[PDB]
């Protein structure tokens, strides 16, 4: 078997549309398990200034009492049939998904529609979850990485709704009453913006029939402006911490470009290193080789994040307070080396890393069904991986260096620093290190 | 033919002069990053004998006096010890070059 063999033989992701704009999607395989969820294209981007945090609030309250199954009957029936249940909400997307057993398909679909469209709001529950969400705000204040990415979004999209954090500010947490939450629920979750995704050992006919049964009566019947990528520098100096956390991003292309595939090849070249890895001095990234040779940083991950027709092309390193500038210089040197004179062999290494990471990621049930949700919301169609192989074969060194000269080279970064960052350069030193006069 | 070459090599080793100061063949090696790597990869007792022979050689060139005749390290009793370490260092350097080419 080869790539034509292993890529032709793939399940097919049969999709359909129920007559409410309800986008339903299934994928079948031979293992006896299922992953069934509702992906919803409504997060914190759609929330205004006074209603920040209601989405995170909903995904807290979505398991705490429906009308037909009250407060503990939902969790009792779920853990009585023996299934896992999970939910999250980013700044755009929100997912409720059940990892369940194959013979529990109709009960899972019934409980999932009851979670979606019939959430009760008892005021005892709103008091409990107000206290719990304030305590989780104070918990997530400690994890430095999420503080850094919230800094990075809040300084890269200054003023737009995209700078709103997921949980929202705390005074906007302790003041939301029930009526605003009911208005939120009755506005966002209606007609086209929800996908019933189902991966694993199920039947597409049964899944379509159960959607047709339970999501009847949902009866769904005006946003998404472009956003401003400002580019700035925020620093939160705190000298009582052992590590410096620095993220830096420029603007990425978005969801709908082949330039996204090109920058995925580039960030597969630059990529990730951590302090616990095996084999230090001989790694393929020159950045990682220098950073082990001189012991600059503890870790970095250099990456891409795409939002609806925008995105950050980012790099985030956790390093000691004595070598921020050296790590910064070597990072911008590697960016400009890929921008100007990147040869063919390292592009081939990037294509191999992209293929291996993509295929090894889309394996199992849960990443497959996550891919179905985010692929029907953002694109409009789930791309089979043969087409990703085609768009990898449409990439040589020339397209990579032209697109990296289009995006990395000579832009205004968003720099976000947290910790002991005195040796972090001032913003014009980042600019004079960004472009080349060939230095 | 055979021993004529051996006569050349033994005569050149007598007329070199470092054998008269208590040195062996691999105590007068030029240092680049390769030979610094090879010195770093040595064992302990040979490294201690290396720094002791070097320190005696620097003393006996400090007062510029050559050792008495009986303590000169003759040919074919010296250790050619650094050769496999330095050989592996040069092989790895050429391996990096011809892999990245």
């Amino acid at each position: 078997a080869t790539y034509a063999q292993a890529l032709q033989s793939v399940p097919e992701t049969q999709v359909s549309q129920l007559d409410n704009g309800l986008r339903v999607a299934s994928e079948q395989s031979s293992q006896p398990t299922c992953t069934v969820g509702v992906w919803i294209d409504a997060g914190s981007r759609y929330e205004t200034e006074k209603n920040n945090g209601a989405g995170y609030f909903v995904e807290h309250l979505a398991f705490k009492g429906t009308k037909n199954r009250p407060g503990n009957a939902l969790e009792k029936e779920v853990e009585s049939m023996g299934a896992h249940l999970n939910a999250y909400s980013t700044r755009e997307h929100t997912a409720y998904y059940i990892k369940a057993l194959s013979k529990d398909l109709p009960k899972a679909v019934e409980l999932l529609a009851d979670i979606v469209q019939n959430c009760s709001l008892e005021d005892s529950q709103i008091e409990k979850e107000r206290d719990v969400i304030l305590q989780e705000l104070q918990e997530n204040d400690t994890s430095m990485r999420d503080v850094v990415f919230n800094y990075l979004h809040a300084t890269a999209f200054q003023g737009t709704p995209l700078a709103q954090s997921v949980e929202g500010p705390s005074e906007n947490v302790r003041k939301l009453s029930r009526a605003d939450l009911t208005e939120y629920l009755s506005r966002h979750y209606k007609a086209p913006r929800m996908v019933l995704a189902a991966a694993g050992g199920l039947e597409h006919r049964q899944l379509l029939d159960l959607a047709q049964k339970h999501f009847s009566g949902l009866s769904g019947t005006p946003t998404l402006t472009p956003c401003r990528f400002t580019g700035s520098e925020i620093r939160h100096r705190e000298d009582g911490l052992p590590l410096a956390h620095v993220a830096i991003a420029v603007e990425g292309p978005g969801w709908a470009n082949p330039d996204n595939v090109a920058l995925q090849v580039a960030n597969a070249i630059i990529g990730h290193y951590d302090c616990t890895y095996g084999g230090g001095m001989h790694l393929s990234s020159p950045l990682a080789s220098v950073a082990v040779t001189n012991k600059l940083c503890q870790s970095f991950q250099t990456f891409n994040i795409c939002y609806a027709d925008t995105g950050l092309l980012g790099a985030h390193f956790v390093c000691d307070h004595m070598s921020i500038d050296d790590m910064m210089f070597v990072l911008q040197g590697q960016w400009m080396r890929l921008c100007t004179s990147a040869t063919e062999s390292e592009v081939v290494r990037g294509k191999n890393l992209l293929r291996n990471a993509l295929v090894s990621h889309l394996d199992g049930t849960t990443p497959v069904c996550e891919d179905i949700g985010r692929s029907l919301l953002t694109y409009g169609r789930r791309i089979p991986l043969a087409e990703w192989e085609s768009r990898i074969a449409e990439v040589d060194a020339r397209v990579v260096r032209e697109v990296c000269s289009k995006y990395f080279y000579d832009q205004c970064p968003a720099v976000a620093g947290f910790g002991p960052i005195e040796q972090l350069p001032d913003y014009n030193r980042i600019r004079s290190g960004m472009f080349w006069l060939r230095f | 033919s055979s021993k004529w070459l051996e006569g050349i090599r033994k005569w050149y080793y007598n007329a070199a002069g470092f054998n008269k100061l208590g040195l062996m063949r691999d105590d007068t090696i030029h240092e680049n990053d390769d030979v610094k790597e090879a010195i770093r990869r040595l064992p302990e007792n040979l490294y201690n004998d290396r720094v002791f022979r070097i320190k005696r050689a620097l003393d006996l060139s400090m007062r510029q006096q050559i050792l008495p005749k009986e303590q000169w390290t003759k040919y074919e009793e010296d250790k050619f010890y650094l050769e496999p370490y330095l050989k592996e260092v040069i092989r790895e350097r050429k391996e990096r070059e011809e892999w990245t080419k």
Binding site: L283, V359, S360, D363 | -
Partner: protein, 414 residues
Amino acid sequence: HPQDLEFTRLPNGLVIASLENYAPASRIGLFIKAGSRYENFNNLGTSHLLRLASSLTTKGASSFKITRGIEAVGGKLSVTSTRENMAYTVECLRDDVDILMEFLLNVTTAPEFRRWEVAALQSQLRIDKAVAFQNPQAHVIENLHAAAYRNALANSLYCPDYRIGKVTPDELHDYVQNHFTSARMALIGLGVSHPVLKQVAEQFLNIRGAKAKYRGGEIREQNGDSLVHAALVAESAAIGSAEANAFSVLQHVLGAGPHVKRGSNATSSLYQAVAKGVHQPFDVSAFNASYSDSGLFGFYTISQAASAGDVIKAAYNQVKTIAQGNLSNPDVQAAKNKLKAGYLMSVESSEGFLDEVGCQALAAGSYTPPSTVLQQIDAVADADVINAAKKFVSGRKSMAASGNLGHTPFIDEL
């Protein structure tokens, strides 16, 4: 799907198994009985230094060529270790199985371990131990397995404080030569064919301790981190038997990890008992660890520094009153559905399936299909559950606790 899994013990001693599916990712697992339990009191931390030594030079391939070739085909070479087993798992796309097969053979059966790389790897050992024990759970479980066995299960996953730097390649050669034999090896393939693995292991391997007693005891740690951790653990059962299956049923009766995120865990009984007793931010879970000769069953609690004692007393009285004959058979069926779900959904993805199939083939020397495993989980009876809880009660305890230990019972005051 015309290809089910294939299984063949080559009579030099080793086990080759495979599963040819049409999945584009190819995995090669190589499972070795060389974990921490095969050490003595003189080469501690040789397992850990051996674990961090994947990328050293082999007889036939230097370390630069190994690292750059593996990352040129972009396969993941990972080394995972439990107290019984080490596991060299190398995965990639199916067009580059042969070169990674060769590097796998190199790292296994061409060991060199030169000295300067060993020193750099000592520094790597210390940093890895720090990153590992920034979690409290690892230190609690390591004091747990140190306080419940006098013998080979009391060997740590990690190298201790003082042996960092004083482990030499002599002990590395010794441990490799007498714990990597041709009978203690399971070569598992996912996505490859059986005759290719037969060629590999038939051509290129050709090479050719003591049971653990129960001890009973306690280990406490004054750490002052305002979260008392406490594990109360008694000897339960060896692996393989329906006795161990009954203890698995018992831990799903008592309480496991949270199935519902940000939930209340109203099916778990221990959480309801302690929540009736105590009104705090707390956590109680069960703990079933299983090994070849023995195994541990107990519970594992995280509480505030004030009232850990009330938590542990309430949980202990709950386990006693389940042991004295007070439970419901629909609760047993809910426990069995949880166990069926846990076993069928621990083998969905690649690495979990590889680990399950490889340990299952290596330990008992033979494979068992998943459907009859579900049938045997169904066949466990209720008097077995009551007798397993009675065996937990009537056995000697063992306790490991960490944190601000001002209000923790020791043995008698449980």
